[PDB]
Structures are given as C-alpha cells and as structure tokens.
Amino acid sequence: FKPGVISEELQDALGVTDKSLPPFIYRMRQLGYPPGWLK
Amino acid sequence: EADRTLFVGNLETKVTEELLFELFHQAGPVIKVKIPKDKDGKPKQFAFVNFKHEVSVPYAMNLLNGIKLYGRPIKIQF
Ligand SMILES: [Br-]
C-alpha cells in the first residue's frame, strides 16, 4: 500500500497536472491511516 | 453478516471497473468492482465497490465522496 501513488490513467481521470503532487495524502493525514490497510 | 459493499453513482461514461478499483484501493483493499449492465448490455452509470473489510466502507465515504472523475463528481450514497 503506497498512498497517493497512482497510475497515469487515474491521473488523467483525476485531472492531475503534476505527477509529483501526491493526491489523497493530505486528507489521509487528517482522517488517519486507512483502517482497512492495517489488516 | 458484514456489509462491505459501496454504491457509487453519477459516474462519467468513460469510468471503468479497473479505474474505480485503483481509486478505491487508496481507501482500502478492494476485492472487486462491478458496473452493472442494462437491458441492451449498456453499462449503467453506477458501480458496486466490494471491500475486503467493512471498516473500509466509512473511510472511503469521507476520503472519496464528491471526487471528480472526468469532470463528474462521484456520489457515494452507501
Ligand atoms: Br483528496
């Protein structure tokens, strides 16, 4: 599980311009570590 | 007895099962994503995301609801 690492197909779907900007990591830091990955 | 299924709607037509798999994989391990068919075999505008664990469902709701895919914000009603 590598958070915010996504494929090029998903980047185009998300509309991400810059591949070095990790998506979803900012909010995960707030929500906490996804519980379904702990187990 | 545990419900690990999410209903996600308002999907743009280009959204695929593999695309949703990778996206919801961020919220937790995903088992499968199914986009049901119409009476003429047409894909519907919603999908079922089945997680390995129930706890992944509320988390994905907060993390991923409203995210725009191809300009269309997904709606996670489940
Ligand atoms: Br986000």
Author numbering:
A (entry chain D): 286 to 324
B (entry chain A): 7 to 84
Publication excerpt:
In the nucleoplasm, however, hMTR4 binds the RBM7 and ZCCHC8 proteins, forming the metazoan-specific nuclear exosome targeting (NEXT) complex. NEXT promotes the exosomal degradation of non-coding promoter-upstream transcripts, enhancer RNAs28 and 3′-extended products of histone- and small nuclear RNA transcription. We conclude that ZCCHC8 is a scaffolding subunit that bridges the interaction between RBM7 and hMTR4. In this work, we have shown that RBM7RRM binds a proline-rich segment of ZCCHC8 at the back helical surface and is able to concomitantly bind RNA.
From the pull-down assays with the corresponding protein constructs (lane 6), we could demonstrate that ZCCHC8285–324 (encompassing the proline-rich region downstream of the Zinc-knuckle domain, ZCCHC8Pro) is sufficient to bind RBM71–86 (spanning the RRM domain, RBM7RRM). The complex between ZCCHC8Pro and RBM7RRM yielded crystals diffracting to about 2.85 Å resolution, with seven complexes in the asymmetric unit. To obtain experimental phases, we co-crystallized the complex in the presence of heavy-atom compounds. Co-crystallization with Samarium chloride yielded a different crystal form diffracting to 2.0 Å resolution and containing a single copy of the complex in the asymmetric unit. The coordinates of the Sm-derivatized RBM7RRM–ZCCHC8Pro complex allowed solving the structure of the native complex (Rfree of 30.0% and R-factor of 26.2%). As the two structures are very similar, we focused on the highest-resolution atomic model, which includes residues 286–324 of ZCCH8 and residues 7–86 of RBM7.
